[PDB]
């Protein structure tokens, strides 16, 4: 009854097909622990594994306290290690790829479970109104801009193809974000995830990491994450040529007062007054060229010099740490053409 590629959509979102590969990947064991036997409890809990070794990461624990440890890790999240004995989570460079591991298998989760409880019915439970934005109208052209325009040429691994742009409606939040509509600094900025998220996403909003997950990794803390060039949220996609087909949102963002960082703070609480922090990159779009939809900014010009030597960043970073300043107005359905 939906239009097709609002169907195509739902079946790109409910794949678990998707779910099943993503396992594969990060090397889990599917005969111990299928997708039905996930739950929350689980994830929250394997997280607070990664509490303890962490906790230990700096101090070291020293195998006595870490084996038993890493081993815990193991009951709730089993593995399959071609043949070689299971890698000791003792490094930092390990408990980064299980923070994304579960970061991941939390939103799978999700999926599963909207999935499995009580293709029409499928996006009711996604709690979302999605729309066509039609090819030829202006909606569709400012959008496109942007897409072609601050294209970053330091991520030359592919070129951007739009395929289908929507226009969503979360359940809930417009009500959410009043308090924040009037605040200034508003930018429909760039969040791009895994295919497999996007049921987390469009039913849940965007969500700031759970207290039990990981110290570090985390830059400017732990809060929602936007760029203004499309390539850096692009990026976040992690598609292969395998799968070319990446999802990648608008959000309006209510920044206020931007907090104006040149290199990592985990930032726990904002100073009184800020109301998101503003990672300044070495580039930034043509300020010139930014157009304005509804009072917000649509920064779209392409990448000159910030002018600013001494920041840590290629390009910006925008954070805010309260799930309200969000409004998600657009959805992409993007190819990746790669380029070797
Ligand atoms: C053990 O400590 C470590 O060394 C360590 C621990 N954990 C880690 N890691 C696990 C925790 N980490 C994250 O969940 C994380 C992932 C993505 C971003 C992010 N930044 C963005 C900037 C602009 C736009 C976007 C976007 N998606 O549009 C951005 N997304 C941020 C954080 C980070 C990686 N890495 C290292």
Known sequence: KLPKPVQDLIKMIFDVESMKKAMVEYEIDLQKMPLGKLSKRQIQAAY??????????????????????????????????????????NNADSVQAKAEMLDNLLDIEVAYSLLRGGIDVNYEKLKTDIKVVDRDSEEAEIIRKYVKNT????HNAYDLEVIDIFKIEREGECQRYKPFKQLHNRRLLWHGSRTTNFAGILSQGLRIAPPEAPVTGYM????????????????????????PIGLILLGEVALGNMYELKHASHISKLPKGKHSVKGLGKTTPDPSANISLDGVDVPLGTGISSGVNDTSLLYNEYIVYDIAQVNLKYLLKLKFNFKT
């Open 220 to 243: 400017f803390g732990k809060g929602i994450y936007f760029a203004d060039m499309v390539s850096k949220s692009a990026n976040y996609c992690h598609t292969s040529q395998g799968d």
């Open 151 to 154: 294209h970053a040429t330091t």
């Open 48 to 89: 607070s594994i990664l509490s303890e070794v962490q906790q230990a990461v700096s101090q070291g624990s020293s195998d006595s306290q870490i084996l038993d440890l890493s081993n815990r890790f193991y009951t709730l999240i089993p593995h399959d290690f071609g043949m070689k004995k299971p890698p000791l989570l």
